[PDB]
């Protein structure tokens, strides 16, 4: 508590090298004597005030130092572990030259010390948002896809806002965005998110573009049938089809929509494998 003051004195004074150097040698001593919680609090607090002071380089360096200690002390992914990283990600300038390196560092620690192949979902929720601030749209998409329920909300917004930015909208335009929710959530077998994000997205589409449609309902399932958006019908049917795991429905569906089958060739081959155990490759219709 006492050397945190001497430190943030040196930071108000703009003595950045002294602040950095002093904190590190003091942090070393805590690591040396295996007082990891002390090093963790000192280092992360240090990183935070460099970032608040717009000293990207030194704050970034201290984030890597934190991750080094996290690794050393075998700090498991939990709420407290992750919140330190979330608090730090908040103060990162989206423009930091090593943003992606820092993100990869954080994510990689969360892979090593949890049972998630691709990292902690709650962490991914925050990383996603940062990436989007830097206009790193495709990276944000991935992290949201692998995130929490909040991430799903943010993902729909990301895609919805993007579609609205498009100057010359079209029949095939809406599907380019909508298909991304259906495919991505089908790929990770989150049927729930698939359905919920489809509903948010289609409602917004209806309320803004006033397409001609009628809701078709059978045994608690609903297709919003669009008179002018075949693509959108196909995509909704695709989701329900995967749920049934019935190869013949999958085949029927593809046989009816020959063009969409070609357009989504590789996506459909994968879904056929994941949901229907189809070993046979896609025979190319054209």
């Amino acid at each position: 508590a006492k050397t945190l003051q001497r430190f943030e004195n040196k930071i108000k004074a703009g003595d950045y090298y002294e602040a950095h150097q002093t904190l590190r040698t003091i942090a070393n001593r805590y690591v040396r004597s295996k007082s990891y919680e002390h090093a963790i609090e000192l280092i992360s607090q240090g990183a935070l005030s460099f970032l608040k002071a717009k000293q990207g380089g030194s704050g970034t360096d201290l984030i890597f130092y934190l991750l080094e200690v996290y690794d050393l002390a075998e700090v498991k992914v939990d709420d407290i572990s992750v919140a330190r990283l979330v608090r730090l990600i908040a103060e990162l300038d989206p423009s930091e030259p090593n943003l992606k390196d820092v993100i990869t560092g954080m994510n990689n620690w969360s892979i090593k010390f949890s049972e998630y192949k691709f990292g902690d979902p709650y962490l991914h929720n925050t990383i996603g948002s940062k990436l989007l601030e830097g206009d790193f749209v495709y990276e944000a998409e991935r992290y949201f896809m692998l995130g929490t329920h909040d991430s799903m909300i943010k993902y729909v917004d990301l895609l919805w806002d993007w579609l609205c930015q498009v100057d010359d909208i079209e029949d095939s335009t809406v599907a380019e965005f909508f298909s991304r929710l259906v495919f991505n959530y089908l790929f990770i077998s989150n049927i729930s998110f698939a359905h919920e994000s489809k509903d948010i997205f289609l409602e917004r589409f209806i309320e803004k573009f006033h397409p001609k449609y009628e809701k078709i309902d059978k045994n608690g399932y609903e297709i919003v049938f669009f008179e002018d958006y075949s693509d959108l019908n196909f995509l909704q049917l695709l989701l329900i089809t995967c749920q049934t795991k019935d190869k013949s429905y999958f085949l029927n569906l593809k046989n009816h929509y020959l063009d969409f089958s070609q357009a989504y060739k590789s996506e459909l081959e994968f879904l056929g494998q994941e949901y229907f155990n189809i070993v046979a490759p896609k025979q190319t219709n054209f």
């Binding site: 991935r142 298909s179 790929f187 990770i188 077998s189 078709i216 049938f225 049934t244 879904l271 994941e274």
Partner: protein, 52 residues
């Protein structure tokens, strides 16, 4: 109107056939993210540049 009757009929019939019994995976099904091993197939890049 009847210009899209053929596709309306097809969608309606397909939905009925697909939901004759409860689909193997329910709407609320979520594979635990702990068990997710891969991310499927890469999706195409969008034609549009992105701003804010």
């Amino acid at each position: 109107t009847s210009a899209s009757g053929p596709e309306h009929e097809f969608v309606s019939k397909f939905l009925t056939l697909a939901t004759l019994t409860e689909p193997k995976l329910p709407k609320s099904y979520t594979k635990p993210l702990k068990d997710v091993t891969n991310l499927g197939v890469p999706l195409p890049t969008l034609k549009y540049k992105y701003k804010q």
